[PDB]
Symmetry: D2
Subunit: 328 residues, 4 copies
Amino acid sequence: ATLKDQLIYNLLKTPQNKITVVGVGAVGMACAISILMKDLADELALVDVIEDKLKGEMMDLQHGSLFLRTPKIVSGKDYNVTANSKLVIITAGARQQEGESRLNLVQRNVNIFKFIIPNVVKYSPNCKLLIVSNPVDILTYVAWKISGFPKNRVIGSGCNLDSARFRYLMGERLGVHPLSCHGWVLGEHGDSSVPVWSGMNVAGVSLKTLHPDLGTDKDKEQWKEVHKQVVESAYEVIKLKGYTSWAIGLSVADLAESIMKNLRRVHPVSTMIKGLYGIKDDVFLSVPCILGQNGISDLVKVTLTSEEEARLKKSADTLWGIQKELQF
Amino acid sequence: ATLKDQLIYNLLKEEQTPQNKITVVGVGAVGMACAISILMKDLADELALVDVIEDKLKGEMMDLQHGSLFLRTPKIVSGKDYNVTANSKLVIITAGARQQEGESRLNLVQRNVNIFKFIIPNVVKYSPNCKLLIVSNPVDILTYVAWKISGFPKNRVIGSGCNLDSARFRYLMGERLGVHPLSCHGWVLGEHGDSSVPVWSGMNVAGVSLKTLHPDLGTDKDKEQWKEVHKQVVESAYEVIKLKGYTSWAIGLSVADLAESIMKNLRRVHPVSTMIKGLYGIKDDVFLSVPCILGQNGISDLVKVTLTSEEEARLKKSADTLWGIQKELQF
Amino acid sequence: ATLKDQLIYNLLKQTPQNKITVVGVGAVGMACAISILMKDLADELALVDVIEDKLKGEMMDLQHGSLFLRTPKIVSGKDYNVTANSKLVIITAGARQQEGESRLNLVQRNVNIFKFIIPNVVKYSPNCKLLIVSNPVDILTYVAWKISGFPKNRVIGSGCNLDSARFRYLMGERLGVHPLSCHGWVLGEHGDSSVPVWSGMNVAGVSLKTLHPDLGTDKDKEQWKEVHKQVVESAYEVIKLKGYTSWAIGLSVADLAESIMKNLRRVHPVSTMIKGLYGIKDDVFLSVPCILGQNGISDLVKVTLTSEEEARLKKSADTLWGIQKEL
Amino acid sequence: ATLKDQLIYNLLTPQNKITVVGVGAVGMACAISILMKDLADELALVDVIEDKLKGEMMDLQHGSLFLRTPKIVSGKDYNVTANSKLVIITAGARQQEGESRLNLVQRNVNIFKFIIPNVVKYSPNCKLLIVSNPVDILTYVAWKISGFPKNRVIGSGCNLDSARFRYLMGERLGVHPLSCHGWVLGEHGDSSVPVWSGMNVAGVSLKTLHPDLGTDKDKEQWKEVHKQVVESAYEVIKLKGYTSWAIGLSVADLAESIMKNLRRVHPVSTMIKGLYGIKDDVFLSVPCILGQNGISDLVKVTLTSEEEARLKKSADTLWGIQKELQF
Ligand SMILES: NC(=O)c1ccc[n+]([C@@H]2O[C@H](COP(=O)([O-])OP(=O)(O)OC[C@H]3O[C@@H](n4cnc5c(N)ncnc54)[C@H](O)[C@@H]3O)[C@@H](O)[C@H]2O)c1
Ligand SMILES: NC(=O)c1ccc[n+]([C@@H]2O[C@H](COP(=O)([O-])OP(=O)(O)OC[C@H]3O[C@@H](n4cnc5c(N)ncnc54)[C@H](O)[C@@H]3O)[C@@H](O)[C@H]2O)c1
Ligand SMILES: NC(=O)c1ccc[n+]([C@@H]2O[C@H](COP(=O)([O-])OP(=O)(O)OC[C@H]3O[C@@H](n4cnc5c(N)ncnc54)[C@H](O)[C@@H]3O)[C@@H](O)[C@H]2O)c1
Ligand SMILES: NC(=O)c1ccc[n+]([C@@H]2O[C@H](COP(=O)([O-])OP(=O)(O)OC[C@H]3O[C@@H](n4cnc5c(N)ncnc54)[C@H](O)[C@@H]3O)[C@@H](O)[C@H]2O)c1
Ligand SMILES: O=C1N[C@@](c2ccsc2)(c2cccc(Oc3ccc(F)cc3)n2)CC(O)=C1Sc1ccccc1Cl
């Protein structure tokens, strides 16, 4: 008699909260570990083109199962392992080098998405797509176009990380935890991001009202340097360690939490902003969105100054110029 | 007239003294996995990172700091100088040479003994009352080395040991039986490596002895070949190294688990590297994994496992092999 | 337009995915609710009771703590339409023991309550798992299974999960080890006829019975039988002191709910139909270690019992069957 | 030797101790919330009703397997309280039918006259977190009796009022309370002040978008949201007889910042002498930076002439009661 038969009496012979991570590099694995440690999924699937690395990463995670509450960890080059995922996170692709723009990655990662997106949609037609690969705003547009999904189920990580870094720096300046420091960085996840100085507050006390020179060139405290630091942060980290991983992994797990738990929390994520701020094109960029079980259900209509709105329009114009030049 | 002064009214001068400080030495794949795991388990109010590569260290620290909004650890610091390490309750050593494909952990001994000669005195200088958690390989020998250099009592010197081996064994057991590893009980003791001992007698699900049900358990004449489960545990690191170049996630999770018991004074039983002199006929200062009670003072107690003649012989072989290497140690 | 319309632009104009219902909002129901809420097990919590004021007050109190939780929807109502598409339905409704009263003395008045509750739950959540807490839990799990017409896998009684948790707490206190590291099983009836499996008692896989052969024997100088007697009497002791038990059972239920909602496939001592084991030929429900996941009880662990242990379980089983057939 | 000696070979103070004084509905909700948030390595409970206290402690202890707090203690004697980092006061007299305001406040002062010296004796370096009503007056009372610096004396104050306000705001807008920002300050209860200027979603000022916000000339009547905060509090009492879960969660949130030295901003009762023209030793809710030394800083909120007057009236009324009190 088998030991299993002697020990266990079987009564009877489909995952409810499945998450897939595409690309098991530094970003993909940081997302995976953060999601597993937050108990967001009952099943985790991993996909990559490098079969050895993929099997090794899956095994390393599986060896930690005793310390996790995610009972099934799967991987494969074939997308059948991704079937019936509630959320699919795309982190596959070329990463920006020291001093290189994220916009220089566009043709390399567009070609990667041309293969990935149809495979993901085939096995999880009702999933939400969470794009992380750079340039995140353009690649969210690309994923939306290739998938044919409604705009609500296509989300780019966007400025959730930029806003998180801004709040970290704000917190460091004021001696307050980032959770209690409120500030929004919108638009392009990159060089043309927009700091909304008007919305900056601690305990609902407007920083701009207290200090009218906030973010202007008149400012003796040079608060504009906080946003420069945000723009330059990725470049700085890339210069020091070769890539960024932990902060984005944590930012993704935060977005995944609101989606998986249907929290309806407000996050700055890449979404289609056509019809807002005089944008007439199919441009994707970060604006505050209500995140839940159906992805982006609503958009917060931020009151911007004429200067803030102009900066956002410049960001959108730059992104559309790149987007027009794409063939699918 | 600053914005800070206009917004905030200060009641007290900055009275900095961290109550639950953790330090990670070595910010490679292992150190960073340990750091992220500890950060996501809210085990510390302060995290300190040390390395010899200053750029990598600054980059890693910054990457973690950029995630502060999503964490509940208000202070993350780093530096080449151990003054950043001051008053840590727990210091985790992950610095050093790692095995290449097919290389024994025992081949790393001279290289990492050489670096421990520098690290251990620096950690003890700034955190004299800390608990030391050794991860660097060979973990059993390096726990002995850390204990000898520090001059600390044996309770405050802990090696990660077979906590990971036992965890991998339970994962495989669980997969074979269709039960969560949490409900599958089994112990891998001794050397964190090739000479680890599977305690077949203690293997159970719901207190039901697997050896009693299947007397062939762990033997060569076993039709089910359960001895292969332990073989898979021994090879696991080699197979992962072959595939991705190193191991990181499972060890970081295993370290965070040990840190949880220490920081929270849980008094949970873990298979960790400790001095086993006086047990199983071992007369020498050998460090190897045995089940220990882990709390706020590190290892407070040892579980005296009843072993079969075969099991005890295997453990004695492990201890003999480790002492032979320890004997020749120059430091 | 409205401030809401000026501030928020709507994109989308769905069935609950991880819904849990708690029936009965008394001390037990509310302890289960708070435990489940703090463990992030559900995206929707529904509450049902017959006392409408108490139900509204409890719902509101929970809703006022929403900022500190990650369960976005908390609903309540006397009508079971609020319960629709629940993955798990927890029954805590009914009469509780008075000081010195047996759980078996609640059977007839709690059977009548179930005759009304179970058809209403099955109507709105036909594919749910039923988790019975109301006493006598073993008999009422049988009752819920009979009324629902559900397969035995989707009908679970909280059973000896709490008895085993209390046993491990006491074991831990005696040994100076965390209950997590102290292993021991209390099986059978959640009550006076529960069975301590002395053979399975261990720390780090080291058998306590092997080390101390007198374990759970009358001769035993350390009197380890007293740990089990303390387990039997625990509810009686707490009832005498505070009037009822709530926190420990809430935590125990949340633990069972975690295995079910997350499909963990952990082993728990829960009330299930044991027909076919230990010479039991009747439709008796009692605690045995079960594998708990998304389909409830998928498997049963076949514990090796001594002739005395098996006889005690059979006596427990005989007592329960006698009551069951008379309903 | 003993089984313990045969099994375990021995080789060899609480670092994160929390005390809850008063094991009523509030105290027990605080206890369960703190236990489920892993904030302490030791939990101590104190009350005057010895049976209820022992029963509550036991019920919690029986759930030890599901928790990560290795030691739960209780007792009428404050020696169980020794070396607590945080002491939470939820103890209080149950108001009688006739009772005047001063009658009720003096009865609670009489309770504090006994509690506060006993807590300070066993935990001289602890932070005091006052929950007992009237929270503003009793925080002042605790500060006076203890002799502690104002940073180590905190009143739960308006944290619950703000939490309820955000819940209602969230329900109006279809946004999670975490993403709805709004502050209710001043006197906890009927005389609380909604700061309309600070109300926002994603940093978008609601007052800027809708200038009639919180005024009487508002078609949307947002003033009703604050009325509902003051109103829902009475609604819970009428419906279930007390409030527990929301305040328990609110207190655990405050405890988290203190224990983990987070330096998060909370609306808590503190001494506001020197602000808004207040010249007396009055305790009111303002946003404070909470960490390992309690209140280290405060946020200087810009208030309207009306908002400033309300706070001044509140402070004048509180001081009038405070000078006629026997200590
Ligand atoms: N805030 C952000 O949005 C943010 C932050 C950091 C990095 N990134 C981006 O994330 C991406 C990845 O970063 P990284 O550090 O992990 O790089 P990486 O080199 O570590 O990993 C990329 C992985 O993608 C895999 N891959 C390539 N083509 C694939 C395909 N067709 N299918 C499946 N997998 C494929 C590679 O094999 C590799 O494992 C980059 O585009 C980077 O710029 C975004
Ligand atoms: N016990 C276990 O279960 C287990 C599991 C996996 C790996 N390991 C071990 O952990 C160690 C590290 O693994 P890894 O993958 O992180 O290697 P790694 O090369 O990626 O990282 C090693 C780090 O140590 C640093 N370092 C070297 N000398 C130092 C010094 N004198 N002071 C401070 N830092 C110094 C390096 O600069 C480097 O960043 C190895 O010894 C490895 O075998 C143990
Ligand atoms: N380990 C265990 O299994 C365990 C432990 C503790 C208590 N219990 C049991 O749980 C049950 C409840 O305990 P309690 O302390 O919460 O009692 P309680 O009186 O405080 O609560 C019972 C609730 O059930 C409600 N109720 C009654 N009939 C109902 C109906 N037809 N539909 C909906 N709700 C109804 C009541 O109105 C009441 O609110 C008891 O049967 C008790 O013995 C079991
Ligand atoms: N600040 C808030 O937002 C808020 C919210 C809800 C309740 N409350 C207040 O909390 C207090 C308690 O509420 P409750 O529902 O728990 O009341 P309760 O009557 O149920 O509990 C009070 C407890 O205090 C105990 N007690 C009385 N005197 C004592 C003493 N000298 N030492 C130790 N314990 C003593 C009682 O025995 C009792 O157990 C009340 O003052 C209430 O108004 C405050
Ligand atoms: O939730 C709450 N419940 C309490 C209450 C309720 C209505 S007034 C006071 C509460 C608790 C227990 C008994 C109790 O008995 C009463 C009832 C009415 C009284 F006038 C005085 C005491 N009262 C205590 C309390 O402070 C709050 S919070 C709160 C109260 C009023 C307005 C706004 C807020 Cl946020």
